[PDB]
Amino acid sequence: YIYQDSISLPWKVLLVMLLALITLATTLSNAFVIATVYRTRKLHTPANYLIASLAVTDLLVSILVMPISTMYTVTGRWTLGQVVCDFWLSSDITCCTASIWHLCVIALDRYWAITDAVEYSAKRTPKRAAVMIALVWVFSISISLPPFFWRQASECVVNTDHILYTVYSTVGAFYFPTLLLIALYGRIYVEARSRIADLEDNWETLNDNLKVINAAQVKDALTKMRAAALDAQKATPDSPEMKDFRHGFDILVGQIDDALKLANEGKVKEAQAAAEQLKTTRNAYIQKYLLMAARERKATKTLGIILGAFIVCWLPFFIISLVMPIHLAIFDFFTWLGYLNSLINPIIYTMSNEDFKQAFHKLIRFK
Amino acid sequence: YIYQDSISLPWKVLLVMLLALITLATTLSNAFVIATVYRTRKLHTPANYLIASLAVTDLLVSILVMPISTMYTVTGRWTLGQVVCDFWLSSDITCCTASIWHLCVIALDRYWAITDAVEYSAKRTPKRAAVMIALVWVFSISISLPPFFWRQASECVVNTDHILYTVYSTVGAFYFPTLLLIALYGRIYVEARSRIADLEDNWETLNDNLKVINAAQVKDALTKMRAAALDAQKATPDSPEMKDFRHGFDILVGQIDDALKLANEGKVKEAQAAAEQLKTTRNAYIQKYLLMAARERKATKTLGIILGAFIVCWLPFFIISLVMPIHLAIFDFFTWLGYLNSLINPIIYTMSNEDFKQAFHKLIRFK
Ligand SMILES: CN1C[C@H](C(=O)N[C@]2(C)O[C@@]3(O)[C@@H]4CCCN4C(=O)[C@H](Cc4ccccc4)N3C2=O)C[C@@H]2c3cccc4[nH]cc(c34)C[C@H]21
Ligand SMILES: CN1C[C@H](C(=O)N[C@]2(C)O[C@@]3(O)[C@@H]4CCCN4C(=O)[C@H](Cc4ccccc4)N3C2=O)C[C@@H]2c3cccc4[nH]cc(c34)C[C@H]21
């Protein structure tokens, strides 16, 4: 029995439009992300090549899997033969696993950048990403290939005969990637909260007291700026390159010390001018590392949203497909919930990553 | 800083005795299980060879890992050099992973027996188990071997440098095996509750009404026995071998029909004798399949307990070692909680499996 055979004509048509609309939006939305990295010179970074490859897999889901899936989800009956059934089931498994595994490659790349910015820079080559993408495609194709034990050839479903493969395929495609991301993103969230916020918070406090400039109240603000500079200095096993970050603050501390010398003497005009002097000369050594932090905070926020979107979309499906061996609409809804992640990913990047956001404003011609 | 350096002399000694006591109990308790399968002729089954191999791995943990671990847990300092450190860490990882993977092999074997008793019998050869044990040892040794990236050589700990291996090792050794067991045991529990209890419950009801044999009350008991026989018949895609199980009940139903013919006529002595006649002749065709169910119910109860013991012992440790990348006593306690599973497994088999329970009563000379 097919539950779809009891659905009314308006609901079946409404569902055909809805599904075709999200398939086309997935095609167009990914096509844009791919085009943007290709078109934009600034975006020719190994990091953006991973975003583009993630968008290629999601474009392949929208072309090879989703349109032919609207036909099957609404009617409930396979009508394209065994050869197209086998190619579609395999292309479903490879593309959806590769989309998930691209996330981990994007999250390992982020992890190594936030964990070893100095050493990782030389290693993070576009040639390295090429191997990581190829490895992801190799691992994904190698998942749909073993369930070809069909020594037999209406309905098109993946072979559930061998329990051990059903669970291995569920591990390699989801549970291994998500446990990796907990461990990976957890570290990223600890680094973004304890360091990419300690530099930014202690700088806010420094600029807030600079904006203040009675002479008595200036002395209390100048000693508040000194404390924030020392707590901002500790953000940053030899010390090369980080000595430059550490120097700017040590100078700002010395400049605050020389300014307070004029403030303690009683001079107000000589001290107020000494504060606006280090204002430009601080934002000459510090704004370099400070701007870096905004880019870090930004890139981890989008990843956080991407990972949240990934868990919400793919956890129900993989929880159900593991429970399945132990209603059909629930399964049809969750496959499309997983398919929806291919549409959610490009919109997250276009709304959170300002390179793609600016890029989008350019094609719609919005200022 | 070592937390152990602040522990008092009586507590350190008390902890040395406690740990040596559980190490020796693990050695002796596994040695017995191994000996029992080796000594007993009846126990020369591929199923019992898995119990014995599971006991070999747990004996290897008690010899190669646990005694040298009491020294380290109580003192908190490694004092046996780098060569013994590397062999001990590797032998820890291989043996503990193999013990866990033996569980899945024991649970796949149970799953295939309860899911395909007829076809699986011919496949379940001791030669098949030899490959499954070798595959488990091959996979386990292959886990401790990659963390040999130590291009460097007080403290003896596993290399945590490469995050991707830490999580892969955590997946291959625990999360993949436990998700497999949920899927495997879930099926076993569904088969044991819906079938190995439907035969047993409908037989209780049949024997309860036979124990009854006023003539009016006999007719209500005889028609209650008929209903239970038809519901017991449905326990059991061609029908060979299962036609023999189905026949016994169909005859019992016919024998109840012939008995009720004497009961409806008004005859009490002719009908009461007809019930005690099918009592022996039923327990000639049915007690064969009925005894099989007790053995099935028994074997799934021990597995349930083993799996429960496995989750309680190994989940905290593997949850912590995945959290670790994102106090040292917590880690020392949970390793020993995992080590304890090597002692819990042989006592579960000796108290739940009646072959080992009888075997134990023989060495202590108890009747
Ligand atoms: C979202 N995708 C849907 C694919 C799917 O479920 N296909 C079928 C045709 O749709 C079903 O869900 C339908 C819905 C109504 C009844 N259905 C089914 O019973 C099965 C369930 C099933 C799920 C997984 C594997 C085998 C069967 N289904 C199928 O086999 C399955 C597909 C998949 C299988 C194995 C590993 C994988 N990695 C990544 C993926 C993936 C993508 C994933
Ligand atoms: C119970 N076993 C204990 C082993 C262990 O934890 N060894 C060390 C020496 O003890 C520690 O737990 C101690 C306790 C006090 C501080 N310790 C540590 O920080 C680490 C933690 C650690 C755990 C896993 C991997 C690497 C480090 N530890 C170690 O490396 C680790 C060991 C293990 C690692 C990887 C895969 C594995 N499969 C099966 C196992 C296994 C068995 C498992």
From Swiss-Prot, chains A, B:
TM annotation in the entry: 10-35, 50-74, 83-108, 129-147, 163-186, 303-324, 328-350
Extracellular membrane side: 75-82, 148-162
PANTHER family: 5-HYDROXYTRYPTAMINE RECEPTOR 1B (PTHR24248:SF201), ADRENERGIC RECEPTOR-RELATED G-PROTEIN COUPLED RECEPTOR (PTHR24248)
UniProt protein name: 5-hydroxytryptamine receptor 1B
Disulfide pairings: C85-C156
Binding site for ergotamine: D92, T97, V158
Tissue and organ expression note: Detected in cerebral artery smooth muscle cells (at protein level). Detected in brain cortex, striatum, amygdala, medulla, hippocampus, caudate nucleus and putamen.
Positions occupied by motif DRY motif: 109-111
MF annotations from Gene Ontology: G protein-coupled serotonin receptor activity; Gi/o-coupled serotonin receptor activity; neurotransmitter receptor activity; serotonin binding; serotonin receptor activity
Subunit description: Homodimer. Heterodimer with HTR1D.
A GO BP annotation: bone remodeling
Subcellular location: Cell membrane
Keyword annotations of the record: Behavior, Cell membrane, Disulfide bond, G-protein coupled receptor, Glycoprotein, Lipoprotein, Membrane, Palmitate, Phosphoprotein, Receptor, Transducer, Transmembrane, Transmembrane helix
SUPFAM superfamilies: Family A G protein-coupled receptor-like
InterPro entries for this protein: 5HT1B_rcpt, 5HT_rcpt, GPCR_Rhodpsn, GPCR_Rhodpsn_7TM
PTM notes: Phosphorylated. Desensitization of the receptor may be mediated by its phosphorylation.
Annotated consequence of substituting C96A: Abolishes agonist binding
